C-alpha cells in the first residue's frame, strides 16, 4: 500500500535523525567507556548486577535495523547506559564520573531532538 510506504519513509527519516543524535551523544564519550558491551569474560558476574545491559554499539545495531519507533525508546536505551554504570560503579571511579558527564552533556542534545521530532512530526 501507499500508506505503508509513507510510514516506511517517516521511520527512515526518524532513523536518519536518531543516527545523527547517536553520533552527537557518542562524541560526549571520548574515552569510549560506553562504546561496547561490558565484557562477560572480564566481568563474569555482571548480569547478577545489571539485568538490562546497554551500550552504544548495541544501540547502533538496533538503530540500523530501524528498531527505534520513537525518540522515547531511543532515550530509554541511552538512559540504561548511564544508569547501569552509576549503579555498578562507585561514585569515586573514572567510570561513574564518565556517566555523569555523558548525562549532563547529552541532555542538551536530547532537549533539541525532542523539539525536532515534535516539529518534523
UniProtKB/Swiss-Prot annotation:
Protein known as: Bromodomain-containing protein 1
Give residue ranges for domain Bromo: 9-113
What is the species of this protein? Answer: Homo sapiens
Task: Specify the superkingdom.
Answer: Eukaryota
Its function, per the record, reads: Scaffold subunit of various histone acetyltransferase (HAT) complexes, such as the MOZ/MORF and HBO1 complexes, that acts as a regulator of hematopoiesis. Plays a key role in HBO1 complex by directing KAT7/HBO1 specificity towards histone H3 'Lys-14' acetylation (H3K14ac), thereby promoting erythroid differentiation.
Where in the cell is the protein located? Nucleus; Chromosome
Q: Which gene encodes it?
A: BRD1
Q: What is known about its subunit structure?
A: Component of some HBO1 complex composed of KAT7/HBO1, MEAF6, ING4 and BRD1/BRPF2. Component of the MOZ/MORF complex composed at least of ING5, KAT6A, KAT6B, MEAF6 and one of BRPF1, BRD1/BRPF2 and BRPF3. Interacts (via PHD-type zinc finger domain) with unmodified histone H3. Interacts (via PWWP domain) with dimethylated and trimethylated 'Lys-79' on histone H3.
Cross-link type Glycyl lysine isopeptide (Lys-Gly) (interchain with G-Cter in SUMO2), residue numbers? 41
Give a brief account of the tissues where this protein occurs: Highly expressed in testis.
